Amino acid sequence: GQVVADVLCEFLEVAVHLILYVREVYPVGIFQKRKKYNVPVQMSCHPELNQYIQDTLHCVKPLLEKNDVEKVVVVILDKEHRPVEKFVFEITQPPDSLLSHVEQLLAAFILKISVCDAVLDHNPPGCTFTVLVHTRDFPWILADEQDVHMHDPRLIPLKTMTSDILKMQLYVEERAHKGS
């Protein structure tokens, strides 16, 4: 419950940072190399961005603890507010060093994100992002059709894990026609 939520929030934070870097949602200049799960990552040093991500995940946490999250999705949006890429983490919490084990498995997802630009086309200039949470001060709103609908998605599998406390699949849906 709490263990899984903590591990996942910490992983999701690193993964969101890394997605924002490899998809060029923010300038490379704000990111610093760091190491997480024993693998190289890139983390934003900009305090407002970082606080945004943190606040988002702090809100997700209690839902994870109660196993109410089906998916967490990092959505990259073009200047027109059209979803062009979605990184979908589908999450299931199933019914001696389990943390070291699970972290080595999470490392695999990080590794796959870090190279996903090999399988995706460039994004258009001026993209932004949001996070969508699919359920089973920092106010959340129901998503609209605009935030979600993506015409002609191509699904690109990135990684799947199974463990005693967590099963998770990460895939990307890329809009087939980004436009530029």
Binding site: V25, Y26, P27, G29, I30, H46, E48, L49, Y52, I53, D55, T56, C59, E70, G126, T128, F129, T130, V131, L132, V133, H134, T135, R136, F138, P139, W140, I141, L142, A143, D147, V148
Partner: peptide, 21 residues
Amino acid sequence: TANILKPLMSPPSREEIMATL
């Protein structure tokens, strides 16, 4: 659809970030 939530506030724009750099 009924069980998809997003933050009401947006992240800072890239432009906004670039303004500080």
